[PDB]
Design a protein around this ligand. Structure first.
Ligand SMILES: [Mg+2]
Length: 365
């Protein structure tokens, strides 16, 4: 059980350089309406958008492999890999680099479908348990295994000592109930190479099924500067969570000694599951219900950082969609912002774009 700290590795920020980006492929009918064709189209657009900036590796199950290979341009690598769902942010390896056996490693955290037998999103995650090792074993990258539950969507970093997380997820009884905050914290200092932490109380409103991972709540936009899901509608259940996190962050000082500057990134108008979308879900007794009228957990903070690229959602609220793009462009002056139409199609299953990706950092030399 040696740690990454003992070998010099740590996790770099999303803005650092990447070899390529990993993405899975949707399939299960109890989570992807209409035999997943609508979401397959959006996943495929996501993978084509990211390939304009950097190489994409898509992975599809044996049954789906030919379908994904026909849909995607040949420039997108398509590899066979069995999984139980397609959120590679959370079953993907969290990659870590060493500054001086390769110069890149990846951690394979334990997984339980966002809480386990009694509070998770589905009842069988056996294939999801090998996707971590299958990716690093296909890339010939060393694997540090952890027995603690953890999802990449529940942990962010600035690449300079500050890990950003959520109490709702990390300190949840469906996660690591026998671990205190200092135990879990000590593991993250050891495995992510971090020194300090910023704990926001909860995840985004409507993310109760996954326990509120941070990438739908807040991330860093560069050092010392985080984007925060926001609303001014005081009647929305999200407003008290945004103002709460704004209080916390504005009194936060990072590991390098900087006062945190929060930029607000306004969520779209409230979005709700429709009967046309819910009735496309096949109820089989293996996944949680997807009901019309539902408050879909939808925020623009759940984008991806590719080499000089920003892959951002478009949810259909034309006013909020345009205002998120203005906000993001003002923020990554050295990247090009690209939008994904029908973002709402991967969000019906509770996630979006960052949710579906796994960056592989370029290996140092
Ligand atoms: Mg794993």
């Amino acid at each position: 059980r040696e740690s990454p700290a003992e070998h010099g590795y740590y996790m770099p920020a999303e803005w650092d350089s990447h070899a390529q980006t990993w993405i899975g492929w949707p399939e299960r009918q109890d989570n992807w309406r209409h035999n997943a064709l609508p979401a397959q189209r959006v996943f495929a657009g996501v993978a084509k958008a990211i390939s304009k900036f950097e190489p994409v590796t898509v992975c599809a199950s044996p049954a789906q492999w030919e379908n994904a290979r026909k849909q995607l341009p040949e420039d997108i690598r398509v590899v066979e890999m069995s999984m139980n769902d397609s959120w590679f942010r959370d079953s993907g390896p969290t990659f870590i680099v060493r500054k001086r056996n390769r110069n890149i490693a990846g951690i394979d955290w334990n997984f339980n479908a966002w809480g386990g037998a009694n509070d998770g999103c589905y009842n069988d995650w056996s294939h999801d348990l090998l996707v971590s090792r299958k990716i690093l074993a296909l890339e010939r990258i060393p694997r540090f295994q952890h027995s603690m539950i953890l999802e990449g969507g529940s942990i962010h970093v600035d690449g300079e000592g500050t890990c950003l997380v959520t109490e709702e997820c990390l300190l949840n009884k469906n996660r690591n109930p026998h671990m205190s905050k200092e135990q879990i914290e000590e593991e993250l200092k050891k495995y992510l190479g971090v020194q300090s932490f910023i704990w926001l109380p909860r995840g985004l409103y409507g993310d109760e099924d996954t326990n509120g991972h941070i990438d739908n709540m807040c991330c860093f936009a560069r050092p010392g500067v985080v984007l925060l899901s926001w609303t001014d509608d005081e009647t929305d259940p999200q407003y008290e969570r945004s103002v709460e996190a704004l209080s916390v962050l504005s009194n936060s000082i990072d590991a390098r000694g900087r006062k945190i500057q929060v930029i607000k990134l306004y969520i779209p108008e409230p979005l709700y599951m429709t009967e046309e979308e819910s009735s496309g879900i096949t109820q089989d007794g293996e996944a949680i219900p997807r009901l019309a009228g539902t408050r879909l957990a939808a925020s623009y903070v759940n984008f991806y950082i590719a080499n000089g690229g920003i892959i951002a959602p478009q949810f259909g609220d034309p006013i909020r969609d345009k205002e998120a793009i203005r906000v993001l462009s003002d923020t990554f002056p050295h990247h090009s912002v690209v939008g994904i139409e029908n973002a709402r199609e991967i969000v019906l299953a509770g996630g979006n774009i960052h949710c579906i990706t796994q960056q592989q950092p370029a290996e140092p030399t």
